[PDB]
Structure formats: C-alpha cells, structure tokens
Scaffold this active site. Structure first.
Site, PDB file in Angstrom:
ATOM      1  N   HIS A 117     -51.067  36.297  66.012  1.00  0.00           N
ATOM      2  CA  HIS A 117     -52.104  35.291  66.233  1.00  0.00           C
ATOM      3  C   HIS A 117     -51.557  33.964  66.744  1.00  0.00           C
ATOM      4  O   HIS A 117     -52.299  33.175  67.319  1.00  0.00           O
ATOM      5  CB  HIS A 117     -53.033  35.107  65.009  1.00  0.00           C
ATOM      6  CG  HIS A 117     -52.466  34.240  63.925  1.00  0.00           C
ATOM      7  ND1 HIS A 117     -51.724  34.746  62.881  1.00  0.00           N
ATOM      8  CD2 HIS A 117     -52.551  32.903  63.713  1.00  0.00           C
ATOM      9  CE1 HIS A 117     -51.360  33.758  62.081  1.00  0.00           C
ATOM     10  NE2 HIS A 117     -51.849  32.630  62.563  1.00  0.00           N
ATOM     11  N   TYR A 192     -54.923  25.154  53.081  1.00  0.00           N
ATOM     12  CA  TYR A 192     -55.605  26.365  52.648  1.00  0.00           C
ATOM     13  C   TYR A 192     -55.421  26.757  51.166  1.00  0.00           C
ATOM     14  O   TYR A 192     -56.247  27.451  50.602  1.00  0.00           O
ATOM     15  CB  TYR A 192     -55.412  27.515  53.622  1.00  0.00           C
ATOM     16  CG  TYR A 192     -54.148  28.282  53.498  1.00  0.00           C
ATOM     17  CD1 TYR A 192     -53.949  29.149  52.435  1.00  0.00           C
ATOM     18  CD2 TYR A 192     -53.184  28.220  54.481  1.00  0.00           C
ATOM     19  CE1 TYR A 192     -52.774  29.904  52.324  1.00  0.00           C
ATOM     20  CE2 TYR A 192     -52.008  28.972  54.397  1.00  0.00           C
ATOM     21  CZ  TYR A 192     -51.809  29.813  53.316  1.00  0.00           C
ATOM     22  OH  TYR A 192     -50.650  30.555  53.220  1.00  0.00           O
ATOM     23  N   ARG A 229     -38.279  14.154  46.288  1.00  0.00           N
ATOM     24  CA  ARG A 229     -37.709  13.513  45.107  1.00  0.00           C
ATOM     25  C   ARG A 229     -37.545  14.516  43.971  1.00  0.00           C
ATOM     26  O   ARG A 229     -38.437  15.315  43.720  1.00  0.00           O
ATOM     27  CB  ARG A 229     -38.641  12.395  44.654  1.00  0.00           C
ATOM     28  CG  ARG A 229     -38.227  11.694  43.393  1.00  0.00           C
ATOM     29  CD  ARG A 229     -37.269  10.563  43.701  1.00  0.00           C
ATOM     30  NE  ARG A 229     -37.528   9.385  42.868  1.00  0.00           N
ATOM     31  CZ  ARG A 229     -36.832   9.061  41.777  1.00  0.00           C
ATOM     32  NH1 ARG A 229     -35.818   9.828  41.381  1.00  0.00           N
ATOM     33  NH2 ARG A 229     -37.139   7.967  41.082  1.00  0.00           N
ATOM     34  N   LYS A 231     -37.779  14.111  40.790  1.00  0.00           N
ATOM     35  CA  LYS A 231     -38.824  13.907  39.788  1.00  0.00           C
ATOM     36  C   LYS A 231     -40.181  14.436  40.268  1.00  0.00           C
ATOM     37  O   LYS A 231     -41.225  14.063  39.745  1.00  0.00           O
ATOM     38  CB  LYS A 231     -38.937  12.419  39.446  1.00  0.00           C
ATOM     39  N   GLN A 252     -55.060  39.751  47.452  1.00  0.00           N
ATOM     40  CA  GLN A 252     -54.663  41.149  47.245  1.00  0.00           C
ATOM     41  C   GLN A 252     -55.715  41.954  46.502  1.00  0.00           C
ATOM     42  O   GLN A 252     -55.484  43.107  46.101  1.00  0.00           O
ATOM     43  CB  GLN A 252     -53.348  41.227  46.496  1.00  0.00           C
ATOM     44  CG  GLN A 252     -52.163  40.757  47.305  1.00  0.00           C
ATOM     45  CD  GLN A 252     -50.872  40.762  46.492  1.00  0.00           C
ATOM     46  OE1 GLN A 252     -49.819  40.365  46.994  1.00  0.00           O
ATOM     47  NE2 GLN A 252     -50.952  41.217  45.231  1.00  0.00           N
ATOM     48  N   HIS A 253     -56.866  41.317  46.325  1.00  0.00           N
ATOM     49  CA  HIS A 253     -58.009  41.867  45.612  1.00  0.00           C
ATOM     50  C   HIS A 253     -58.361  43.304  46.058  1.00  0.00           C
ATOM     51  O   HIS A 253     -58.648  43.552  47.235  1.00  0.00           O
ATOM     52  CB  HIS A 253     -59.174  40.917  45.832  1.00  0.00           C
ATOM     53  CG  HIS A 253     -60.363  41.200  44.982  1.00  0.00           C
ATOM     54  ND1 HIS A 253     -61.198  42.275  45.199  1.00  0.00           N
ATOM     55  CD2 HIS A 253     -60.890  40.515  43.943  1.00  0.00           C
ATOM     56  CE1 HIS A 253     -62.176  42.252  44.312  1.00  0.00           C
ATOM     57  NE2 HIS A 253     -62.017  41.189  43.542  1.00  0.00           N
TER      58      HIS A 253
END
Ligand SMILES: [Zn+2]
Ligand SMILES: [Zn+2]
Lengths: 424, 435
Positions: A117, A192, A229, A231, A252-253
């Site tokens: 794509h 997304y 960073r 932290k 993956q349903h």
C-alpha cells in the site's frame, strides 16, 4: 468545540489544505480504517481520512517541537511542511477496507505482482499533485518540488552509504517521524492507537503530548536519532501495553478476521464482472485497478455495496457471500497454528494453501480446496537520554460432519508442514 | 472491545434475529449526522450503532421501572416490545438521515407528506414479513397481532379518549420511553446525545445511568408518567445544556448545513437518471423509492458515490456538484433570518422559496440580475418535566431559522444576492438580517 475527537481543532497550512481538498485525498473518506472490523465492533466506523489528518497534524507537532528545543539541528520551515505532507499522504495508497486489500486480496487475485500500500501511496501522491497543479503552489511556499517531492515519497516508502536523496544524512532524524520500521515508534502509530482505542472502547494510557514534550535528537553510534528522556519510560510502557491490547483484543479478533476473508472471497468471485473506469476510458478490474491511478481513485468501500445491490446474474455468487454476512452465516473457525522456527509463509504462497490443506491425507466426508479458507495474520530497543505470524483455517461448509472432517485435514497439514500442533 | 458508549451489550435472541437482517443492516450505510462528516472528521458514525444503543437503552429503563415498581405489572413481553421499538425507530431514515425527509423529498415531491417515522413503520412491517420473524415472536411470548401494533405505535404515535390500541391506558408510561414528543426526554435522545458528543469532541455531562436509577412512574393529572427524583435536577440541567450545545455548535453549523444542501442539489439533478430496483423488477427513482420497501432497502449513502463515480453524461450536472464538495468550492453563505412572530414556513413551500427571493425588487438598482436557480434557501428547525420527592412518591411535585446561499461565487453576485435577500425578508416580514 466540535473538532477531531482526538486532536481537537487543528488548523493547517494553506498548502496542506490544498492537498486535502482533492479527490485523490477525499478518497479516504470511503475506506474503513479497520476494514471488516466494523462488522464486529459497532464503534469502529472511522475511515482513513480522519486518521490521515491526525498523522499530518502529529508529524508537524513533533518536528516543530524538536526544532524549537534544538535550533542547532537547523530544522527549517521547509523541512516541517515536508514532514507534514508525508504524514498527510502516507495512507493515500490504501485500497478497499485498508489492510485487507494489499494484505490478502491482491496476493490471492494476482500472486505474481509485488504490491504494497505504500507503493500505492507514492503513486497516488504523484498523481495527486499532478492532477491538481500543486507544484506551482509548493514553490509558492518555499518548497523545492524536485528535492522535496523526493523527500516526501522517501519518508512514505523508504529509500527508492546513505540511502536517501531527499535530505542529507545530518537531517536523518526526519526520516523517523512518520514511518519508523526500526523502533516501531512513529506518529503514525500514535494516532491510530489513540483512535482505535477511542472507537473500540479500550483504555489507552499512552500520552503522546508528554512524550513529544520530552523528545530530543542525539547521537547513537555516530547516527542522529530521536531519543526519549529516561524518566519517560513509564509512559513508553503504557504505549506498548496499548499496542499489545489493540492487537490481542481487536486486530486479531477471531470473527473479525473471518469476516475479512469472506469479503475477500466476495471480491474474488466478483473480480471478473466489475469494471472500474480508468484514464483514457480504459476499463480495469478490482484487482487490476492498481495499475492506473485514475481508476484506483474510484476504488473504495463502495465496491462492496455495488456487489451487494447488484442484479447481475454473473454476480450472483459474490452477492450470496455478502448476503451471508448480513445474515451472519459466517465461515466456521477450524483452528490456529503458527510456523515453528524462522519461516514465514510468503505472500506469493497464499493462493496455494487451501490446495495443500485439502490434499492432506489424515490418519467419512471428502473436502475440496474450495471449502477451505486459510488466512495468514502478521504484525524495547528504543534509545534514551539523561537530563510474529499465525495461520488460521476456516471452513465454508458449516455442517457438523464437515467441520469434524475439516479439523482432520487441518491437524494433518500442520503435521506434515511442521507447524505447531493446534489446541483442542 | 464493544460499543464505546454502552460497552458490551448482549441482547435477546429475538432482538438479534431482527438485527441480522438486510432491512436492518441497511443502517450501516446511513451517516448519522449526514453531511456533518464533511465538516467534522470525527462524525463517521452511522444509524446502525445508534439504533443498537437505543434498543439497549430502552430495555434498561423499562426493566428498571419494572424492578422498582412491581405494582405497574410490567411483563417480560412488555419489555421485549419496548426494546424492539427502540431498535427499529430509525429503520426509515434515508440517505444522510434528516437531510432526506427534511429537505430532499419536500423539494423533489412537494405534494407528498413523508416523514422518516412513517417509513420506519413500513420498513419494520416489511422486515418481519421478509424474514418470518412472526413465528419467532410467538416463540418468545409475543402476541404478533397486539404487539406489532404496540411497536409501530411507539415509533409513530397513534395510527388514527385514549389514542393507542397496542396497550391499555394503565400502561401508558411505556409510550414515553422511545419517543417522547411532550417532554423531550426519551432514550432516543440520550443515546445520540452521548455519541454525537463522543465523536464531535464535545463535553457531555448528562448521566443517564444515574437518571435511570432514580426514575419512577407516578400520577400526573390522573395520568401515569415517568418522573425524576427532585434531587436529580442538576443532572437534568447538564442534559439540556448538552442538547443546546450539540444544536448551537454542530447541528446548526454554517458550512455543515451548506454542504447538506449541495448534496441535496446533487440528488435532485440526478433524480431522473438513477434507477433503483424494487419489488417485481419495477424501477424507481431516488425520490420515489419511498413508495416500495424492496427498493428503499437499497437506498443508502451509496447513492452518493454512485453519482460521484458515474461516467454517464446525463449525470454530469450532478457529478459536478459532488465534485464541488471534494474541492471545497461550496455555495456561499448570504445570510440568516427568522420568521419571529410570523406564520412558519411549511414543508410544502420549500420548492417555491428561491423563486420568491429572486423576484424581490431591491430598493437600489443592482449591477447584476440573479435567477431562482442561483439561490439555495434552507429552513432549519428543531423544562416541563415532572418530579417527585422521596417522601411523597407516586405523585408529582429559536423555533425555525431560514438561511440563504448563493450558487454564484463572484463578489459582484454575492453583493447582489444579499440585496435580494434583505428585501425578501422585508416584504415577507422576517427579522432584519445582521451585517
Ligand atoms: Zn496510518
Ligand atoms: Zn434515533
């Protein structure tokens, strides 16, 4: 006040809006983001258009922030616009139902052709700025069409010694903002992750704003990279946990992917009989519209309803499958295995898999290749600073005596192919 | 992963039978806010998810009223009916929802009185007929004769002293759950308030769960109504504030409604040339598919792309408008007025309004003449709740605005258009427009 539910009101550069207010771009209003997910999760009605705007906006935020914090990187008003356009256009090439199309249909419909794509996003983009005279407008805003169009395509598809021709190696970090294959972290996924959670009703605890605020460029093996960073590692954990959750629970349903392969079975049984009109007047097929951008522009989710509503007797076979879906007589799940070792079933091999399964002599009823659908399903080294593939088989026959048979072929195929033994 | 607003809902097998049906699946292809999508990227939701929500919510409320007040004698049958009504109330929406019965049909066929609820009732009848649902209702304790009546009735109100035939007057409160024209509060609104905010990025502070928990039935002028605990008034304010916000900020959005009228202009210029196949083989037009449910079932948002992608030269005029939208050369806003204290504009009058505007002689002679074809005029339309105190339960304690657009986009024409518009308001006695 009404804007994008994830980024709120975004206002864009006039050049960005010129690219958007375009049929090649508007095309994305008609491509379900999660494709056949919609038929399993009512919330997931979003299309790639909104997503694309998100990534454009996010690409800009990050580049512009890196710029302000580190003027020494010499990030220009031109460099920023380019990254934005790349984020904006990275998904131009997606076809009907997003990943279902380059991921499964095309490899079944035309196994010889290598099509991705992103290739398509690069052609579609070229055709976009050509069909709308965007080039004079780029020049107008400080862009150098020759050098920059290259740069934009490159950050969408990677290289077409230092691979890239669009920017010098000292501005290499710009190539990790929109698409980052190495560390997995790009603004693409950030968007997304946020909206797939927002529509799926999944908790998303990653905070990209915080991450952006604490991001910096720095030397990693004499190479310029975007670092986070130290932290900020608890925020990074929160991201990857979200990635893993969208994957385990949604992408993956079980039934979700079943439906995807039925829709693909419909397109295939319809490929001969639907004509899409391309450049010059020439006619293309669904599977073949990828050869001409004029036609591809008109290849969207519409094609689904065109079949569904059709009256043509040639298209009766296809219609019937799409009608299977409305009634919910889905293909039946038979089982899951994955290849041991390194090997991944290659895309060129998809068309042959059902012939294989059906040819597996098990140790009552006989099944033919037409009765099996097999789909392949595929998918911590980040740098800091201080201040695989699984195969499922479905059966198109839904009677108890046939499923038992189908499981029998399946278990054997796994056997004489050396995949993991399926779970009872 | 479930509905982002109600989470995982599991439904009755009867409800699922109704849903797994082409007449119902039709709703996967009707944008909820219609032409809103082209102005708010978030608003990609369709009526299908919405419908499920209302079905689920209808059930919650009825079932809760039931447990709190067994004396109301609310049955497993009464519940199923209310659920099906909530589930099917929107079956009749056509392409782009309200744009279709609200503007297209009144322009395309001004003589015919058509409302989307009428259509929901025909579509529902056709649904249970085309899928043999009736044997399945009987299977689950429903009385098809009495209940199909009841369902239709709570979707369209009386189909004809106590108006309804589906339930006796002592179970009258059931008729205020799915559609409540009187007090504005129904589970229909609750759902679409929740999701229009969820996709528009608007703060929604109404909490329907809390409201449902504190709801009760009680006598109001010897009539059974659904009342709300007095201590629940701050939650009610939060609702109405959201209603007003979705309206001021989204449903009335300047460019949003402009785009809606362009899509309507496209369908009209295409009405002659698109054939929809109905029952028997007969062919219908977009505007006329409402006469046969076989064809209407196939009239969805698809019709938009069918025109957009078309190659027919007959359909060039329509295509060009839909192409206007992708490029964002929209009709130009000219102004807004309302008929304050005047008689409102009836749906039958819509077709004639542009002829009127264009016929208005302005005071100063203008350097350009405009024709009816150059004006788009769209009409845009849309606290007495009953309470109870813990102590003594069981007893109770704009309207239309007109905007004008111009299809001509040059400066010299807009100035002209505003001139006609200001005059039309003058000799029609509408409010003077704001400069
Ligand atoms: Zn993307
Ligand atoms: Zn509704």
């Amino acid at each position: 006040g009404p804007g994008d539910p994830i980024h709120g009101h975004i206002e864009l550069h006039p050049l960005l809006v010129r690219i958007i207010d375009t049929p090649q771009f508007q095309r994305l209003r008609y491509i379900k983001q999660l494709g056949g997910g919609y038929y399993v999760f009512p919330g997931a009605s979003h299309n790639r258009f909104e997503h694309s705007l998100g990534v454009g906006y996010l690409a800009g935020c990050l580049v512009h922030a890196l710029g302000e914090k580190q003027p020494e990187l010499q990030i220009s008003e031109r460099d920023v616009l380019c990254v934005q356009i790349a984020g904006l256009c990275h998904d131009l090439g997606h076809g009907p139902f997003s990943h279902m199309f380059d991921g499964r249909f095309i490899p079944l419909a035309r196994p010889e052709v290598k099509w991705t794509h992103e290739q398509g996003s690069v052609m579609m983009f070229e055709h976009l700025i050509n069909s709308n005279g965007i080039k004079p407008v780029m020049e107008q805003y400080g862009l150098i069409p020759e050098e920059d169009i290259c740069f934009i395509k490159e950050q969408i598809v990677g290289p077409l010694l230092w691979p890239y021709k669009g920017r010098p190696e000292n501005k290499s970090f710009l190539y990790e903002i929109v698409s980052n294959k190495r560390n997995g972290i790009d603004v693409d996924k950030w968007d997304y992750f946020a909206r797939d959670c927002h529509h799926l009703g999944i908790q998303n605890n990653f905070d990209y704003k915080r991450f952006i605020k604490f991001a910096r460029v720095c030397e990693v093996d004499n190479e310029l990279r975007i670092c986070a960073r130290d932290k900020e590692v608890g925020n990074l954990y929160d991201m990857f946990h979200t990635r893993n959750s969208l994957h385990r629970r949604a992408y993956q349903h079980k039934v979700g992917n079943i439906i995807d392969t039925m829709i693909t079975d419909a397109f295939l049984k319809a490929d001969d009989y639907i004509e899409i009109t391309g450049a010059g007047g020439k006619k293309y097929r669904i599977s073949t519209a990828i050869d001409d951008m004029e036609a591809y522009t008109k290849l969207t989710d519409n094609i689904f309803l065109e079949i569904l509503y059709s009256t043509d007797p040639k298209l009766k076979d296809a219609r019937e499958i799409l009608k299977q879906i409305e009634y919910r007589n889905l293909f039946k799940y038979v089982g899951e295995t994955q290849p041991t070792g390194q090997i991944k079933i290659k895309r060129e091999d998809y068309e042959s898999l059902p012939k294989e399964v059906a040819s597996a002599k098990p140790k009552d009823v006989k099944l033919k290749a037409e009765d099996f659908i097999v789909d392949v399903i595929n998918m911590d080294h980040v740098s800091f600073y201080c201040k695989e593939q699984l195969i499922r088989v479905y059966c198109k026959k839904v009677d108890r005596k046939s499923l038992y048979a189908a499981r029998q072929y399946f278990v054997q195929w796994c056997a004489d192919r050396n995949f993991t033994k399926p779970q009872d």
